[PDB]
Amino acid sequence: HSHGLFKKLGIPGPTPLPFLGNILSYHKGFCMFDMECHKKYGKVWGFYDGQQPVLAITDPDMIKTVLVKECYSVFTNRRPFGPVGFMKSAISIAEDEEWKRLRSLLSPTFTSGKLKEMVPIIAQYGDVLVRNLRREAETGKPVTLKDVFGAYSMDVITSTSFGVNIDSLNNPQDPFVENTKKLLRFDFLDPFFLSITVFPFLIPILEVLNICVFPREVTNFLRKSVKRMKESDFLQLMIDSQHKALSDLELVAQSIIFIFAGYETTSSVLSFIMYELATHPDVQQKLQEEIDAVLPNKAPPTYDTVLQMEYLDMVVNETLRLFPIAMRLERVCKKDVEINGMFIPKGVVVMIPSYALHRDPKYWTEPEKFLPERFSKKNKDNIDPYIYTPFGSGPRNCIGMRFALMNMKLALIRVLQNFSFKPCKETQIPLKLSLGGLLQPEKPVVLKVESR
Amino acid sequence: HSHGLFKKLGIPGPTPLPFLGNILSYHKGFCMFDMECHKKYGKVWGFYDGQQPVLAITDPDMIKTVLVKECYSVFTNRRPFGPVGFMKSAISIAEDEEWKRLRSLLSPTFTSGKLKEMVPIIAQYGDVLVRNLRREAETGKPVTLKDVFGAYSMDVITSTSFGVNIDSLNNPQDPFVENTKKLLRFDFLDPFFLSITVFPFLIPILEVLNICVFPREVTNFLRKSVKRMKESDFLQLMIDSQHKALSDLELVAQSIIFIFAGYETTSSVLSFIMYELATHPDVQQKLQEEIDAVLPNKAPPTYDTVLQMEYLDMVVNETLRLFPIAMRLERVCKKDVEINGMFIPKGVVVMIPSYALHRDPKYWTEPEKFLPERFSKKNKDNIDPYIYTPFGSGPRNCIGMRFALMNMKLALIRVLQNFSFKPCKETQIPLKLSLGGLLQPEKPVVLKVESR
Ligand code: HEM
Ligand code: HEM
Numbered sequence: 001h002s003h004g005l006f007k008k009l010g011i012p013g014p015t016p017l018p019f020l021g022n023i024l025s026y027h028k029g030f031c032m033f034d035m036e037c038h039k040k041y042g043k044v045w046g047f048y049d050g051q052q053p054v055l056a057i058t059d060p061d062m063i064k065t066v067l068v069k070e071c072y073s074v075f076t077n078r079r080p081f082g083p084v085g086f087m088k089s090a091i092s093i094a095e096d097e098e099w100k101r102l103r104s105l106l107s108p109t110f111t112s113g114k115l116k117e118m119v120p121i122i123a124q125y126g127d128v129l130v131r132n133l134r135r136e137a138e139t140g141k142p143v144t145l146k147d148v149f150g151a152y153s154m155d156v157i158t159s160t161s162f163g164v165n166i167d168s169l170n171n172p173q174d175p176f177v178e179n180t181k182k183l184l185r186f187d188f189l190d191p192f193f194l195s196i197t198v199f200p201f202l203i204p205i206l207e208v209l210n211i212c213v214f215p216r217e218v219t220n221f222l223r224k225s226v227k228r229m230k231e232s233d234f235l236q237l238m239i240d241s242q243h244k245a246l247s248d249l250e251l252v253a254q255s256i257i258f259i260f261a262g263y264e265t266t267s268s269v270l271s272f273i274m275y276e277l278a279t280h281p282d283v284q285q286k287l288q289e290e291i292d293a294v295l296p297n298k299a300p301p302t303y304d305t306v307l308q309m310e311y312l313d314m315v316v317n318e319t320l321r322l323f324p325i326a327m328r329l330e331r332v333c334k335k336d337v338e339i340n341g342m343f344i345p346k347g348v349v350v351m352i353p354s355y356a357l358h359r360d361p362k363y364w365t366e367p368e369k370f371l372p373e374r375f376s377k378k379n380k381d382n383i384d385p386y387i388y389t390p391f392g393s394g395p396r397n398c399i400g401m402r403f404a405l406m407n408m409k410l411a412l413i414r415v416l417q418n419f420s421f422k423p424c425k426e427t428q429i430p431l432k433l434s435l436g437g438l439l440q441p442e443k444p445v446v447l448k449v450e451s452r
Numbered sequence: 453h454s455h456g457l458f459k460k461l462g463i464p465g466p467t468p469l470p471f472l473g474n475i476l477s478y479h480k481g482f483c484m485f486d487m488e489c490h491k492k493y494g495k496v497w498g499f500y501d502g503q504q505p506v507l508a509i510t511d512p513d514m515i516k517t518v519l520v521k522e523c524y525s526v527f528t529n530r531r532p533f534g535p536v537g538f539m540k541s542a543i544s545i546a547e548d549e550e551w552k553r554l555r556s557l558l559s560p561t562f563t564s565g566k567l568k569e570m571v572p573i574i575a576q577y578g579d580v581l582v583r584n585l586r587r588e589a590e591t592g593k594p595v596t597l598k599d600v601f602g603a604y605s606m607d608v609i610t611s612t613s614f615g616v617n618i619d620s621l622n623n624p625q626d627p628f629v630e631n632t633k634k635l636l637r638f639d640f641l642d643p644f645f646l647s648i649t650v651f652p653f654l655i656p657i658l659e660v661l662n663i664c665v666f667p668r669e670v671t672n673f674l675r676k677s678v679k680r681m682k683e684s685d686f687l688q689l690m691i692d693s694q695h696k697a698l699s700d701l702e703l704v705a706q707s708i709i710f711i712f713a714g715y716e717t718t719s720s721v722l723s724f725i726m727y728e729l730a731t732h733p734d735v736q737q738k739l740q741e742e743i744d745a746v747l748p749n750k751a752p753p754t755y756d757t758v759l760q761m762e763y764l765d766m767v768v769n770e771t772l773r774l775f776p777i778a779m780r781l782e783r784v785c786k787k788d789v790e791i792n793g794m795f796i797p798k799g800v801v802v803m804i805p806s807y808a809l810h811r812d813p814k815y816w817t818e819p820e821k822f823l824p825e826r827f828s829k830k831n832k833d834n835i836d837p838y839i840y841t842p843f844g845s846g847p848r849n850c851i852g853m854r855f856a857l858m859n860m861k862l863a864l865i866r867v868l869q870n871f872s873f874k875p876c877k878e879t880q881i882p883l884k885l886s887l888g889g890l891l892q893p894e895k896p897v898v899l900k901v902e903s904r
């Protein structure tokens with residue numbers, strides 16, 4: 001789509017260069033670029049990912065219309081992002097009707113009822129984490145969060161997905177661990193992804209040469225492994241629903257996409273939270289005290305005891321305001337429409353700048369401050385769920401939201417129950433976000449760990 | 453080739469943007485861009501046509517080494533420019549050995565001896581031009597130069613190439629005229645050519661889909677027509693040489709490339725010259741008087757009488773200084789080399805900025821002034837043939853140089869012998885060069901024509 005579009009609609013934005021559009025402006029990252037735009041164009045604005053017109057919108061009403069109201073009719077899909085092969089059938093990648101059919105099939109698989117049943121199995125890998133954390137903190141050495149939580153994230157993933165019970169930290173050898181480690185989030189600012197943003201006409205070329213964003217060796221192993229398992233957790237609940245019709249290949253797709261969506265995310269948010277606890281020892285203390293008041297003398301966490309903890313919730317939700325790892329929510333516009341008096345022409349990408357809104361003065365007091373109290377029950381009724389969107393909104397939000405909260409909360413409970421986390425000379429203060437396309441820390445967070 | 457190259461060699465130039473390199477700087481045209489660079493970087497400099505490193509060089513010595521000395525060993529070829537199909541065999545497109553073989557075969561076809569024989573046949577279409585010029589100036593109407601000279605250029609081309617004698621102006625119907633009209637110079641700043649400069653990886657794709665810069669319908673007509681002619685001028689002289697071996701397809705290639713190279717060029721320089729004569733009526737007069745002193749009372753021009761005319765030559769050569777329609781000379785570097793102490797790495801494009809040098813103060817007094825006197829025999833020994841290069845230099849210069857001068861000179865003699873050319877209200881004063889990639893006037897030159 002040519003570069004006249006936003007002039008002809010009369011929408012402000014940075015003047016695009018030929019071929020590139022505004023990509024060079026990503027040298028700061030999606031996160032800063034989005035702020036600067038909000039700051040200087042106001043409430044609504046447009047830019048070009050190559051030839052692709054992207055309309056940022058920041059009106060809570062409009063957001064709700066896009067994310068909630070017209071989701072089924074107009075704004076159903078995310079923007080295509082690269083050669084995906086069979087993963088076109090993964091719920092997060094799938095489109096229109098085929099997506100609605102898959103969302104319906106998998107919805108009951110993420111019931112609180114089912115979650116409740118998985119708690120005992122997630123709980124088990126708190127004990128494991130604790131154990132691994134004991135040894136390596138008892139050494140006196142500064143721990144690397146990403147590897148500690150990564151190993152935990154996958155421990156909870158392999159076990160809740162495939163029933164395969166492993167100690168990821170003490171089994172790097174295991175074939176099943178080697179592969180799921182490579183299932184990382186894509187950095188859409190790296191050279192591969194920038195290129196196909198500027199050469200989208202290359203996606204079909206790549207499709208045909210069998211090249212795929214989901215590495216073939218990993219996808220092969222997991223399909224051929226689900227092949228065996230099926231011959232004799234999430235796998236099961238899916239097997240059990242066999243429009244309607246979850247098919248064979250559709251099932252492996254989901255299995256894989258649940259790993260993709262949950263692994264580096266969970267472990268990534270967990271890191272950010274421990275960083276905030278270590279740099280705010282008062283918040284750390286207050287939580288450690290709430291946990292003891294509910295689970296006295298290292299009592300094991302449970303579904304209900306987890307949902308009892310206001311301060312925990314406050315800390316988790318406050319960390320997500322600052323570090324909304326999705327950064328943006330997007331939908332592609334299926335047809336010409338008028339939303340809250342605004343004309344959106346077919347093919348444009350509607351983008352909601354979650355990270356920017358999460359840090360907008362209009363909604364937030366001292367937005368840069370880690371301040372769990374914003375989420376206290378007697379002072380959160382003024383938080384707009386269309387401004388605060390770490391899991392998106394509407395029929396296409398994070399299907400694994402409640403699973404990811406519970407899982408994280410179980411990590412933190414066991415970890416804080418046994419330990420305290422502290423600053424160091426390598427600990428970067430304050431934290432500085434990476435310049436690429438993932439919301440991660442520039443240098444992976446290292447902290448000191450002690451036995452309580 | 454990445455954008456580190458000229459930093460790592462320590463050569464100055466404009467900082468390239470990613471993917472584009474310096475192409476946006478072409479919004480002024482090759483002509484201004486080259487000046488500004490010379491003006492601000494000095495004698496030698498580098499820029500990037502997309503990912504393609506281009507080394508401009510302006511030292512007469514270096515130029516001579518590139519264009520003359522190392523031509524056969526290092527700098528033999530021009531830069532590839534697009535899908536060419538069978539025209540890869542045209543002498544101007546052909547490479548290395550295959551080029552040297554074709555240059556050798558066609559050299560004797562451009563002897564002054566052969567030229568001499570074609571004079572009577574070119575001469576004939578002076579009479580024709582005159583005739584067409586009589587009528588349409590006798591109307592009192594302002595004449596369009598490009599159509600007057602275009603029609604003449606092709607009249608001289610069809611007849612010296614294929615023996616086909618036509619009145620192009622009064623035969624637009626003729627199949628043979630319809631096609632050769634479309635054989636225009638390529639504008640390497642237009643969208644097609646800019647794209648394949650930034651997507652050179654697209655040339656092979658285009659080759660395979662049979663798409664070609666030389667339009668297929670025109671190339672088809674000329675091949676199938678040379679097909680017949682051969683069954684029963686330049687065609688003949690080529691037929692007669694049937695390494696060695698001019699082949700069938702190689703022959704049609706040349707036939708076509710001679711049309712391509714001579715048609716819009718000749719007519720384009722001719723326009724520029726009449727513009728200068730009309731805006732400098734003294735120079736016009738002085739020439740009209742030289743012509744009469746050699747060819748008294750409209751006597752018909754001949755080879756020797758044409759070569760007698762110092763002032764004519766002076767006017768033709770002076771107009772070419774200002775309007776060197778090639779603009780640049782280029783060679784691709786076959787291997788790493790050191791030329792006059794300068795390291796040129798393999799694959800770089802050596803570019804000589806003819807138009808810029810033609811207007812460099814260091815060599816030229818009041819460079820913007822149309823001043824035929826710079827070329828007078830008693831004041832031209834200080835003109836460096838490596839600064840003044842309207843036909844390039846060395847073994848790969850314009851093979852049709854002497855033909856094009858003679859042909860032009862025969863146009864001008866007959867035209868000035870019968871007429872005078874004058875300014876008008878539509879005549880742009882002074883002339884402003886186009887912003888694209890051909891050195892042509894922005895608005896096609898219109899002048900008034902009278903009977904002497
Ligand atoms: C803290 C961890 C997590 C965060 C912050 C997170 C956030 C998000 C966000 C922002 C979206 C996009 C929603 C939208 O477009 O409006 C999303 C989609 C999704 N998430 Fe998560 N997520 C996390 C963990 C998980 C986990 C554990 C799963 C487990 C299966 C999961 C599965 C998905 C799926 C399948 C989608 C796509 C839904 C669809 O297209 O219908 N996520 N997530
Ligand atoms: C005023 C008219 C003309 C001008 C200014 C002109 C100028 C040039 C220039 C600058 C080159 C490039 C030389 C180099 O790379 O160093 C060239 C090449 C060439 N010209 Fe012309 N030319 C004109 C008319 C003609 C005519 C009538 C022919 C007739 C056949 C012709 C045939 C060629 C050919 C074949 C080449 C390529 C030579 C090779 O690659 O070996 N030109 N011309």
Ligand SMILES: CN(C)C(=N)NC(=N)N
Pocket residue numbers: 092260261326
């Ligand atoms: C969870 N997945 C796979 C996404 N759709 N990506 C995202 N925006 N979080």
Ligand SMILES: CN(C)C(=N)NC(=N)N
Pocket residue numbers: 544712713778
């Ligand atoms: C005559 N031809 C075809 C060229 N090589 N182009 C040019 N630079 N004048």
